[PDB]
């Protein structure tokens, strides 16, 4: 379970929809030093509590926008975490993936989808006809 008190919000029309209950939902939790007013990602203003907060959001981009552009940039809050919640109750923490923010290099992270050449050396599509391999995926 995810602990925290929801920010003071009187309700809005930009909240969760059927997708939250059917496919997936996201939760962003953070700790603030004081009670202050922030902007909800989908319009309106809410008041984050004195202690640790918990906000339910429809999309992952809402958490990155709120945590990145408001919590960190404006309120100097650096401990926000984003979870993906499934209808079955399974919850996984997805941001920051390994406890370190992605923009800061961290040891043990592998190279994913790295092409060992400059982009101008991608093969022509005519060479890869009927093979199902895109030019950017070619070895």
């Amino acid at each position: 379970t995810l602990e925290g008190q929801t920010p003071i919000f009187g309700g809005g029309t930009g909240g969760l929809l059927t997708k939250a209950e059917r496919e997936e939902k996201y939760v962003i939790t953070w700790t603030s030093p004081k009670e202050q007013v922030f902007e909800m990602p989908t319009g309106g203003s809410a008041i984050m509590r004195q202690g640790k907060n918990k906000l339910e959001i429809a999309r992952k981009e809402y958490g990155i926008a709120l945590g990145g552009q408001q919590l960190r940039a404006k309120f100097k809050i650096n401990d926000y975490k984003i979870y993906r919640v499934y209808p079955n109750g399974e919850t996984q923490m997805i941001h920051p993936a390994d406890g370190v923010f992605p923009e800061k290099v961290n040891q043990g992270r592998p190279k994913v989808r790295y092409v060992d050449r400059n982009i101008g050396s991608n093969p022509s599509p005519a060479k890869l006809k009927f093979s199902g391999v895109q030019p950017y995926d070619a070895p």
């Binding site: 982009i119 101008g120 991608n122 022509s124 599509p125 895109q134 030019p135 950017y136």
Partner: protein
């Protein structure tokens, strides 16, 4: 034919050359251009390459054929 016929054939010549210009430029730039050197890796019909590098609306070769139909109709 008189002077009135002279001018309209030059209007037709203008239409033929511009419609050819739009089509030929799209065909010859299908592989890529300075704005998008790797256009061939994106296929014939894609929307754009984003607002970066100044903006790339109607940059695919398909878009040139789309623009050429307007000139062919004209």
């Amino acid at each position: 034919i008189g002077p009135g016929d002279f001018y309209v054939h030059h209007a037709i010549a203008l239409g033929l050359h511009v419609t050819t210009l739009v089509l030929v430029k799209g065909a010859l730039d299908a592989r890529g251009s300075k704005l998008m050197p790797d256009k061939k890796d994106f296929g014939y019909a894609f929307p754009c390459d984003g607002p970066g590098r100044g903006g790339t609306c109607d940059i695919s070769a398909w878009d040139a054929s789309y623009l050429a139909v307007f000139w062919m109709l004209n």
